[PDB]
Amino acid sequence: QGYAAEISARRNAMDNASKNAGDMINRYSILYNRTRQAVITNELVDIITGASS
Amino acid sequence: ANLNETGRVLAVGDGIARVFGLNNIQAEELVEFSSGVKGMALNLEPGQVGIVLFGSDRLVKEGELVKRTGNIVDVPVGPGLLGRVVDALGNPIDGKGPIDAAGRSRAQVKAPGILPRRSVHEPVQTGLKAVDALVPIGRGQRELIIGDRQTGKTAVALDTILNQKRWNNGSDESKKLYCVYVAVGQKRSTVAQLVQTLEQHDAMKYSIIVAATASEAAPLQYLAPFTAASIGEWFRDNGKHALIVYDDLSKQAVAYRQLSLLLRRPPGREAYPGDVFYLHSRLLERAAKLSEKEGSGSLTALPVIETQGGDVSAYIPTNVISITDGQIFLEAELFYKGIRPAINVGLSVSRVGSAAQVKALKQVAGSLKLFLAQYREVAAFAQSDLDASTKQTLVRGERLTQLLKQNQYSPLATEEQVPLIYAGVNGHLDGIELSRIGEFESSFLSYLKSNHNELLTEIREKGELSKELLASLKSATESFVAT
Amino acid sequence: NLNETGRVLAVGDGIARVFGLNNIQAEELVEFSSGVKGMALNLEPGQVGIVLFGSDRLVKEGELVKRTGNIVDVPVGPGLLGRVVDALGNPIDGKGPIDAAGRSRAQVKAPGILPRRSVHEPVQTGLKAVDALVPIGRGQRELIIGDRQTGKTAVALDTILNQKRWNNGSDESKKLYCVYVAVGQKRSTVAQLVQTLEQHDAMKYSIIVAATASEAAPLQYLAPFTAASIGEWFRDNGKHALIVYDDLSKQAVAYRQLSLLLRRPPGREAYPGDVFYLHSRLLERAAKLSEKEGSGSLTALPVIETQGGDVSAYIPTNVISITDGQIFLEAELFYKGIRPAINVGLSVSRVGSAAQVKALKQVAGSLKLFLAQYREVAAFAQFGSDLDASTKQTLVRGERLTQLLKQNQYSPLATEEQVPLIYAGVNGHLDGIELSRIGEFESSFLSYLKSNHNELLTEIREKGELSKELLASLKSATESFVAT
Amino acid sequence: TPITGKVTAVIGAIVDVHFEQSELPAILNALEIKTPQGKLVLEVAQHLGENTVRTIAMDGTEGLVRGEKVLDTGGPISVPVGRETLGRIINVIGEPIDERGPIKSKLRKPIHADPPSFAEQSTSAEILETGIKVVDLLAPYARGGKIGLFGGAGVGKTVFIQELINNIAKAHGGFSVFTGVGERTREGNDLYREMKETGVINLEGESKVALVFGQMNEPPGARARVALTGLTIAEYFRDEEGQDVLLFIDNIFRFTQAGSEVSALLGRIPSAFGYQPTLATDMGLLQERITTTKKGSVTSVQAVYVPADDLTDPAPATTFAHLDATTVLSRGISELGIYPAVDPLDSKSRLLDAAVVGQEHYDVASKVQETLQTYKSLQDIIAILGMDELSEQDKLTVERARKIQRFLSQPFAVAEVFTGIPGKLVRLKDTVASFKAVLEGKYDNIPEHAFYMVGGIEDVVAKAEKLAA
Ligand SMILES: Nc1ncnc2c1ncn2[C@@H]1O[C@H](COP(=O)(O)OP(=O)(O)NP(=O)(O)O)[C@@H](O)[C@H]1O
Ligand SMILES: Nc1ncnc2c1ncn2[C@@H]1O[C@H](COP(=O)(O)OP(=O)(O)NP(=O)(O)O)[C@@H](O)[C@H]1O
Ligand SMILES: Nc1ncnc2c1ncn2[C@@H]1O[C@H](COP(=O)(O)OP(=O)(O)NP(=O)(O)O)[C@@H](O)[C@H]1O
Ligand SMILES: [Mg+2]
Ligand SMILES: [Mg+2]
Ligand SMILES: [Mg+2]
C-alpha cells in the first residue's frame, strides 16, 4: 500500500513537474527569441558604424 | 522666382527631398511641391534644405519647383471636426467636404507646465466592470492599454467611447467627453469598419477619427498622433473634456524608426533612434487636467502599445509605461480562455485615477482590487490541496472571474454595476452554478429594472451608497437568488 | 614657418584639430595658449588631431598651439612615495613639488625575452584564501575580476596593507613598494582610500596615481602607463613595486572615447581596433628582471569589472588572455558568507606554488584539489541522499576548510599565523569542532601559540620551510589546544 | 556694442551660428535669439572652424530662419543663487516659472563649474536613518553621501523618493533642492502642491526647498542642462552658506538620455548602444560636483531609470560607481506585491561595516543576507520540483527567508492610497532587534502573511493574534 501510495505520489509530483518545467520553457523560449534578435541587431549596428567613416 | 520663397529640388530618395534655396524658410515649415504633395523642412543647411515628404517619393522629381507655405506644420481644430474623419494633415477623407474649422493649431505644441494643472478627480466612465472597479481612469489621466496582438485592446478604447453616449446627449456641459480616435498604421478597412461601428451606435457624432494607415508614408504616421493631440487640446483649452485614443503608438514608433533610419540617425536599442522616448513623452505630456485658473478643460490619453509574446520589458513598452499614469494590461492567456476583458488585474494599475472613482464602485469594490490579485495566489498553488478554508476564496474568485466577464459593445452604467459587485463581493453567488453566472446578470438586471428602479435611480443621482441603500440591496439580491 | 607652432582649426568634445605643427612627433605633448595641455595622436596631411588633458572651454578657433618637443612622460623616483599625483604626475594632494630622480616616458617597451627570470618570490597578501590557493609571485600579472561590489579593491588593498610587515624593516629585497592607480573612480572614493591607508600607516610606502571620473578621458587613458613608469623605477633599480590597476575596464572606455572623438573608425562594441594591445603592452611591462638587471620586479594586479558575471565579454576576455591567472569574485559567494568571495574552481595562479613560502605549500598539500572534491560532493548531496562515511567525511572537512578561509577586511595574516590554521584544517583537527565556532577557534588558537608556542611561529617566520621537528611540534601543539 | 552672429544652419536642437568678427564666443557661453514670443537660449558646444560655432538650443527651434541675428551674452547660462530661490520654481535657464514675479536674488552663478579638487574632499561615515527597514538594515544611506534608486518603468522610484522627502526633508535643518529631469510635469505639480500642504514651502514666509524643473515635454537641451541648474543652486548653499544640503534628482538618467539625443546631430560617431562617446565624462562632470566638501555637505538622492529593465545598459551601469549607496528596485519583487520593491541582495552600502553600524547590526544584516541568498540559490528546484524535494535543513532556511522577505515590505506614508494602510516608519535600532529574533527562530510558528506590510516586531504579534480567530 505504501508503495502504491508512493507510485501515485511520484506520478503526481512528476506530472506537476512537467507542467511547471514547461512554464519555464515558455519564459526561456521567449527570452531566447529576444536575446537572439538583440545579439544580431547589435552586431549589425557595429557593422553599420564601421561602414560609415 | 525668388530663391528666398521658392526652391528647386536637388535630389529625392528614401523619403527625403533636397531643395536648393528656400532662403526664408523656417525650421519645421510646411512646403508644397509641383504635384501637390507637401513636406516639412527638417534640416536647414548652407546651400540646401532637407525636406521630409508627406507621401510617395514618386511624387517629387529633381528640378522641381517648391513653394514656401509660411506655416509650421499644423492642423485645423475647433468643434466643427466632430463626426469627421481627417488624415494626419487634417485633410478630410470621409468625402463629407471641407473641414469647418475654428482655426489652426500647430502639430508640435508645448505641454502646459507645472502651474496650469490640477489633480484628476472626475470619472472617465468606461462601462467595463473590470476597468471601472479595478483600474479607474480620471479626466486628465493617461492610462496605457497594453497587451499582445488581438487581445481586445482596441475594444476597451472603443467601448469607452460608446459609453460616452450616456452624457453626450445631455444638457450638462461638463460631463461631456468628446473623443478622438487616432488610427496609426491600421488597415484602411479596419478604420472604415470601425467608423461604421461608431455610426451604428450613434457615437460618431461626438468623436473625431484621425487616420494615417498601413500604406501611407511614414512621416504621416509619425505625424498623426500629434495633429490629433492639437485637435483634442482645443476642448481641453476651452473648458471641455476630450478623450484621445492613440491606436497605436507601437506602429507610430515603427514609422518613426523608418524615418530615422532613412535619415541615418544612430540606431540604438532594437534599432530605434536615441530619441524615441522623447517622441512619445512630448506627446502624452499634452494630456492634463487644467486648473480653474486656466478653464478646467481636460485632455485624457489612452495610448495603445502592442507587446510581443507578453514581454513588457521591451524598449517601447517600458518607455510609455514610464510616461503614462498606469496600465491596463490585457493578457493572451486570459483572452484565449474567455475572460474578456482580459484585464490581468495583478499587472494592471491606475496611478492617479484613485480620486476619480465613483464612490459606489469604490464601496462594493472595496479591496476587490487586492483580493483578486490574491485569489490569483491560491489558484496557482491549488493546482496541491483540498482545503475547506481556502475553497471559499477559490469560489469567490471563480464567481467574480465570471462576474467581470463581459460581452462587447455592451458598456454598463454605474448603477448597473454596483449591485453586480455587491452580489459578488458579499458571496450571493456561491450556490449558483458557474455556467449560470452570465444568466444571473441578465435576469438580475431586468429584475432590478422592473421592480427596484427607485434604488437604481438613486445610485446614479448621489454617486454614493447610503447605509439605507446598502441595507436594501441586501433584500433584493437574496430575494432573487432564492428563485 | 609653422613648424614649432600651429593654429586651432576646430575644437570641441576635448578634441582639437590644429593647423601646422609641421615638425611635431606622433605622441608629443603640446601646450595651448589658453594653458591647457594636450597630445598629438593624429598626424594627417592637412592638420593634427590633438586630445586635451583637460577642459576645452577656453580653447578657440585660431588659438595658437605649441610644441614641447617631448613624447609624453612623467617624473619618477622614490620621491613620489607617500604622495598622490595626477596622470602626468602633478601633485594633487596639495603638498607642493614632487622631487624626481628622473623622467620616464609614459609608453615604455617591455623587457624582452632575455632580461628576465622566473618568478620565485612571494608577494605575501596576508589573505588566507589567496596566499594558500592562488599565490602571487613577484613579477606576475594576476587579474582581480568580478561584478561591481564583489570585493575586488579589498583584495588589492589588503595586500598593500600587508606589506607593512616588511616595508618597516632595513632589508630592501623583501620590501615591496605600492602603486594604486585609480581610473574612473570618483574623487571621494580615492580620498577615502588614502585615508584608510594612513590609518594603517601604509601611505608612506605607496603612490596614488589618480585620474578620476571628471578628468579628461586622455588623462584616464594615460594614467596606468605613467603609473607603470612610476612603478618601473623600482624594478629598474633592484627594488620591488606592486602596481594595482583599478580598473582597466574604465581605462578601455576612456580609450574608446578618445578614439571616437578623433574619428578613428570604431571596432567591436565601438572599442578601438587595438583595444587589446592597449592592455597587452601595459601588462607586459610588469616583469621580474634577471640578475644582470638587479632583480627588481613589477607585479601587476589589474582589476576588471564584468556585467552580470559575463566573463565572456569583450575586454574581460582580452585581459584574461594577458595575465598569469585570475582571482574570480562572486556576489553569490559573498552573500553565502564566503569572503573574500573567491571562486576557488575558477581562480588560478599560473606561477603556482613556485612563488609560495614552502611552509604554506607543505600544509596546503592538495587543499585546492580537495576543495574541488568538496564541490562535486555538495552537489551529489543536493539531490537528497545520505551517503557513506568517507563521502560525509570530506563533506565535513571541506565545509570547515571553507570557513577557515573566510577573513575580515583590513586583517591580513602573517604566514606563521596562516600555516597553523591550515595545518589544523587539512589534518582533521577541526572536524570535531562545531561549524559556527571556527572563527573564534582561529583567534584563540593564534593567541595560544603567541603566548605558549611562540617558539614555532618564530621558527616558521625565520626558516620559511617546515622540518619534521616543526611538524611533530605542531601536531603536538594543535591536538593540545583542541582539548581546550 | 555687443557680439553678433548669424544662424547658418538648423537641425533639431542643433543650431550652427556664424560670427562675422574673428572674436568667437567661448565654448559653454549662452547665446540669444530674439523670437516673437520671448527669447531662445543657445549654448555653444564646439568651434567648427571658418568662423562658425555649433550650439545646442534650450528650447524648440521651430520658426528659426537661416540668417537670424544671434547675441552673445559672454557667459554660461546663469542661475539665481541665494536664499531668494526657496519656494520658487525655476527653469533650466534660471527664469522663474511659477508666475510669482522675478527671483530678486543678489547674484547669478554659471551652471557650469569645475568639480571640487582632490584636496577639497571631506570623507565621513555617518548613517542617515531613513526609517525604511531594508535601507537601515542592509544598505544604510550616508549623510553627505550619494544615493541612487535604480528601477525600471513603474517599479517604485518616484514613490520611494517621495517617502525619502517626507521622512527626512520636513525636519532636517538644512536646505533641500529638488530637480525634476525628464519626468512627469504632473508629478511636479503634485510635488509643488504637496510642499505647500506640508509647510516645507511657504508662500507667505520662509521656505526649505528650491525647485528646478526640466521635464519630458522639454527639448533635449533643457533635459541635458537642467540638472546643472538644480545643482548650481545646491552648491551655493554648500559652499557660500556652509549648509548641509539635501539634493533630490528625479530622474538622473534622463540627463544622459538627453545627451544621447543630440550626440549625432553634433556629428559624433556613436558608441555602444547608440550613446554619446562622452557618456562617462559627461557623468563625471555632473556627479563629481555633488559632493561633501570641507566647506559643506551634500547628501543626495537620485532616481536612476533602468531602460528595458537592463542594469547593464551603459547609462545605469556607469552610474553605480558614483554612489555611496544603491538600492535596486526589482520588477520581479514588485510583481509579488512586496514594497518597497527593494532587492535585499543587489542593494549596496559603503557603510554596511561594523565600524559604522555596530558589530550586532552587521552580524544580523549578514545572516539575513545569508538566509535570503540560500532561498535564491534554490529557486530552480522550488519552482520545478517544489518544497518537498528539499532537505529539511534547507526547507527550514527557506521557510525563514520567505518570512524575512515579507518582513522587509513596509507601508509608505505616500503609498497610503495603494496599500490602504497607515504608513509605518520604523527606527533603525528596532529593525535590528526585530530581525535578530526572527533569525533565532523565535517566530517559526507564525504564518507568513503576518510579517507582510507591517512595522517592527510587535506588529507581527498583533497581526498573528488578529488572524488565528
Ligand atoms: N469583451 C469581449 N468579449 C468577447 N470578444 C471580444 C471582447 N472584446 C474584444 N473581443 C474580440 O476579440 C477580437 C480581438 O479584439 P480587438 O479589440 O481587435 O483586440 P486588438 O488588441 O485590437 N487586436 P489587433 O488590433 O488586431 O492587434 C475581436 O474579434 C474582438 O471583437
Ligand atoms: N573580506 C571581507 N569581508 C567582508 N566584507 C568585505 C570584505 N572585503 C570587502 N568587503 C566589503 O564589500 C563591499 C565591496 O567591496 P569592494 O572592496 O568595494 O569591492 P569592489 O568590487 O571594488 N566594489 P566597486 O569598486 O564599488 O565596484 C565593501 O562594503 C567592502 O567593505
Ligand atoms: N512603496 C510602494 N508601496 C506600494 N505600491 C507602490 C510603492 N511604490 C510604487 N508602488 C506602485 O507602483 C506604481 C509606480 O510607482 P512609482 O513610484 O511611480 O515608480 P516609478 O519608477 O517612478 N515609475 P516611472 O518613473 O513611470 O518608471 C505606484 O503608482 C503604485 O501603484
Ligand atoms: Mg487594435
Ligand atoms: Mg573598486
Ligand atoms: Mg516616476
Judge contact between C205 and C81, C-beta under 8 A.
yes
CB-hemisphere CA count at 13 Å for C116?
A: 17
CA gyration radius, chain D: 25
Active site residues of D: 157, 183-184
Q: Name the grid cell of D434.
A: 526585530
For chain D, how are helix, strand and coil distributed in percent, rounded to 5? 35, 20, 40
Chains D and B touch (3+ CB pairs under 8 A): yes
The burial of C91, by beta-carbon neighbours within 10 Å (0-12 exposed, 13-18 middle, 19 or more buried), is given as middle
Q: Do B126 and B258 share a domain, yes or no? A: yes
> Which strand (E) or helix (H) includes residue D147?
strand D146-151
Task: Categorise residue D263: left if φ over 0, alpha if ψ from -120 to 50, beta otherwise.
Answer: alpha
Distance CA B213, CA B88 (A): 10
Contacts of B270 in chain A (CB under 8 A): 37-38, 41
Which residue matches cell numbers 539531490?
C383
Q: Tell whether omega for the bond before B248 is within 30 degrees of 0, i.e. cis.
A: yes
As annotated, the binding site of D for ATP includes: 151-158
Task: Give the 3-state secondary structure of B53-92.
Answer: ECCCHHHCCCCCEEEEEEEECEEEECHHHCCEEEECCCCE
Q: Which ligand is nearest to the CA of B148?
A: 1
Contacts of C425 by beta carbon, 8 Å cutoff, 6+ apart? C397, C400, C401, C404
Q: Do B190 and B253 share a domain, yes or no? A: yes
Q: Which range of residues forms the domain containing residue B404?
A: 358-483
Closest CA to B139 of B170, B85, B79, B179: B179
CATH number of D1-76: 2.40.10.170
CATH assignment of D77-351, among 3.40.50.720, 3.10.20.30, 3.40.50.300, 3.90.79.10: 3.40.50.300
Contacts of D26 by beta carbon, 8 Å cutoff, 6+ apart? C57, C58, C60, D44
* Contact call for D278 and C261, based on CB within 8 A: yes
Q: How many angstroms does the Cα of residue D232 sit away from the middle of ligand 5?
A: 29
CA distances from B230 to B73, B346, C19, D426 (A): 11, 34, 51, 48
Per DSSP, C368 falls in state H
Q: Do C350 and C475 share a domain, yes or no? A: no
Task: Pick from A46, A48, A52 the residue to mutate for testing the C interface (most C CBs within 10 Å).
Answer: A46
Judge contact between C133 and C364, C-beta under 8 A.
yes
Q: Do C200 and C316 share a domain, yes or no? A: yes
Closest CA to D457 of D426, D438, D434: D434
Judge contact between B324 and B284, C-beta under 8 A.
yes
Chains that touch C (3 or more CB pairs under 8 A): A, D
Total H helices, total E strands in chain C: 16, 16
Distance CA D464, CA C184 (A): 51
Per DSSP, D24 falls in state P
* Contact call for D281 and C270, based on CB within 8 A: no
C350 is annotated as an active-site residue? yes
Q: Do B236 and B381 share a domain, yes or no? A: no
> Which strand (E) or helix (H) includes residue C209?
strand C206-211
Total H helices, total E strands in chain B: 15, 19
How long a stretch of residues is chain B? 483
Q: Name the grid cell of D455.
A: 512595522
> Which strand (E) or helix (H) includes residue D48?
strand D39-49
> Which strand (E) or helix (H) includes residue A45?
helix A2-49
How long a stretch of residues is chain A? 53
* Contact call for A53 and C265, based on CB within 8 A: yes
Buried b / exposed e over B346-367, threshold 16 CB at 10 Å, is bbbbbbbbbebbbebbbbbbee
In the beta sheet, which residues pair with residue D70? D5
CA distances from D258 to C390, D162, D368 (A): 63, 24, 40
Q: Tell whether omega for the bond before B23 is within 30 degrees of 0, i.e. cis.
A: no
Which residue matches cell numbers 493578457?
B331
Closest CA to D264 of D26, D11, D59: D11
**Pocket-forming residues, ligand 3, beta carbon under 6 Å:** B 322, 349, 351; D 151, 153-159, 339-340, 412, 415, 418-419
Which residue matches cell numbers 474623419?
B85
Closest CA to B62 of B25, B8, B113: B8
Q: Nearest-5° angle of CA D409, CA D413, CA D418? A: 70
Closest CA to B304 of B289, B321, B291: B321
In the beta sheet, which residues pair with residue B38? B32
DSSP-based three-state secondary structure for C68: strand
**Pocket-forming residues, ligand 2, beta carbon under 6 Å:** C 146, 148-154, 339-340, 407-409; D 321, 352-353
Q: Do B142 and B231 share a domain, yes or no? A: yes
Extents of the domains making up chain D? 1-76, 77-351, 352-469
Structure resolution, Å: 3.0
As annotated, the binding site of B for ATP includes: 147-154
Q: What is D352-469's CATH topology?
A: 1.10.1140
Query: The domain that contains C443 carries what CATH number?
Result: 1.20.150.20
Contacts of B79 by beta carbon, 8 Å cutoff, 6+ apart? B102, B234
Q: Which ligand 3 atom is nearest residue D183's CA? A: 25
Distance CA D261, CA D264 (A): 7
Q: Does the domain formed by A14-53 have CATH 1.10.287.80?
A: yes
Q: Which ligand is nearest to the CA of B156?
A: 1
Which residue's CA is the nearest one to ligand 1's atom 15? B152
Q: Name the grid cell of B394.
A: 477559490
Task: Give the 3-state secondary structure of chain B.
Answer: CCCCCEEEEEEEECCEEEEEECCCCECCEEEEECCCCEEEEEEEECCEEEEEECCCHHHCCCCCEEEEEEEECEEEECHHHCCEEEECCCCECCCCCCCCCCEEEECCCCCCCCCCECCCCCEECCCCHHHHHHCCEECCCECEEEECCCCCHHHHHHHHHCCHHHCCCCCCCCCCEEEEEEEECCCHHHHHHHHHHHHHCCCHHHEEEEEECCCCCHHHHHHHHHHHHHHHHHHHHCCCEEEEEEECHHHHHHHHHHHHHHCCCCECHHHCECCHHHHHHHHHCCCEEECHHHCCCEEEEEEEEECECCECCCHHHHHHHCCCCEEEEECHHHHHHCCCCCECCCCCEECCCCCCCCHHHHHHCCCHHHHHHHHHHHCCCCCCCCCCHHHCHHHHHHHHHHHCCCCCCCCCCHHHHHHHHHHHHCCCCCCCCHHHHHHHHHHHHHHHHHCCHHHHHHHHHHCCCCHHHHHHHHHHHHHHHCC
Using the Cβ of C12 and the Cβ atoms of chain D, whether some distance falls under 8 Å is answered with yes
Torsion from C-alpha of B128, B130, B136, B137, nearest 10 degrees:
-50
Using the Cβ of A29 and the Cβ atoms of chain D, whether some distance falls under 8 Å is answered with no
The minimal CB distance from A24 to the residues D273, D383, D388 is found for D383
Indicate the residue type of C401: L
Q: Name the grid cell of D54.
A: 555649433
CB-hemisphere CA count at 13 Å for B362?
A: 16
Buried b / exposed e over A28-44, threshold 16 CB at 10 Å, is eeeeeebeeeeeeebee
Q: Do B210 and B94 share a domain, yes or no? A: yes
Which one of C127, C130, C153 would you pick to mutate in the ligand 2 pocket, going by the greatest count of ligand atoms within 8 A of its CB?
C153
| Residues of chain A in Cβ contact (below 8 Å) with chain C | 46, 49-50, 53
Task: Pick from D3, D112, D123 the residue to mutate for testing the C interface (most C CBs within 10 Å).
Answer: D123
Q: Do C201 and C293 share a domain, yes or no? A: yes
Distance CA D257, CA B319 (A): 12
Task: Give the 3-state secondary structure of D425-446.
Answer: CCCHHHHHHHHHHHHCCCCCCC
Q: Do B329 and B371 share a domain, yes or no? A: no
Q: Tell whether omega for the bond before D346 is within 30 degrees of 0, i.e. cis.
A: no
Q: Name the grid cell of C361.
A: 605549500
Q: Do C64 and C197 share a domain, yes or no? A: no
Which residue matches cell numbers 492610497?
D417
Distance CA B310, CA B307 (A): 6
Distance CA C302, CA C279 (A): 10
> According to the entry, how was the structure determined?
X-ray
In the beta sheet, which residues pair with residue B72? B29
Contacts of D247 by beta carbon, 8 Å cutoff, 6+ apart? D176, D177, D179, D230, D231, D234, D290, D298, D299, D300, D301
Distance CA B209, CA B197 (A): 12
Q: Do C366 and C343 share a domain, yes or no? A: no
Q: Do C331 and C203 share a domain, yes or no? A: yes
CA distances from B17 to B10, B71, B74, B210, B265 (A): 8, 19, 20, 26, 17
Distance CA C110, CA C235 (A): 12
The burial of B175, by beta-carbon neighbours within 10 Å (0-12 exposed, 13-18 middle, 19 or more buried), is given as middle
CB-hemisphere CA count at 13 Å for B367?
A: 7
DSSP-based three-state secondary structure for C39: strand
Indicate the residue type of B356: A
Distance CA C100, CA C80 (A): 7
Q: How many domains does chain B have?
A: 3
Closest CA to D414 of D162, D49, D86, D87: D162
Closest CA to C122 of C361, C294, C347: C361
User: Helices C438-451 and C415-426 meet at what angle, rounded to 10?
Assistant: 120
Strands (E), D325-435: 325-328, 348-349
In the beta sheet, which residues pair with residue D53? D17, D47
* Contact call for A52 and D385, based on CB within 8 A: no
Distance CA C340, CA C439 (A): 15
Chains that touch A (3 or more CB pairs under 8 A): B, C, D
The minimal CB distance from D270 to the residues A20, A24, A49 is found for A49
Distance CA D275, CA D273 (A): 6
